[PDB]
Design a protein around this ligand. Sequence first.
Ligand SMILES: OC[C@H]1O[C@@](CO)(O[C@H]2O[C@H](CO)[C@@H](O)[C@H](O)[C@H]2O)[C@@H](O)[C@@H]1O
Length: 122
Amino acid sequence: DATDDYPIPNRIMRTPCTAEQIMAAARDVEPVYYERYMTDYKNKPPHVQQAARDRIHWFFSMDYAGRRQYSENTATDAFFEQLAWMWPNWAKLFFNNKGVAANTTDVCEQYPPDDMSVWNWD
Ligand SMILES: OC[C@H]1O[C@@](CO)(O[C@H]2O[C@H](CO)[C@@H](O)[C@H](O)[C@H]2O)[C@@H](O)[C@@H]1O
């Protein structure tokens, strides 16, 4: 039920980067996407914020096989991901579209892996 790029962009399933690398890249090369995401994030309660960080860290901790199985799970069942009951767009910056995915993954490796400052906005 998944395609190569939907629901999760191919480049995102293949990248060696952390979430924080992709976010730092977005801040520079996809700033509108970054700012839309952080605006959404900052409006969520702390428990939801924490859950999104934990879940995206889990996602990028997997290899391609794990990421692809997640994509398949969410392609076959739109309600697979429990976080979506609280925040459907918890991973919008990462998974929304392949153009953003290509731009961010083209440069994410140039950024530091663990820079948590990307989670602080205003
Ligand atoms: O497709 C609905 C399903 O997708 C999830 C996967 O975690 O949401 C992420 O992926 C979507 C599809 O690419 C993005 O549009 C969305 O912004 C992102 O959070 C789940 O939350 C949801 O159950």
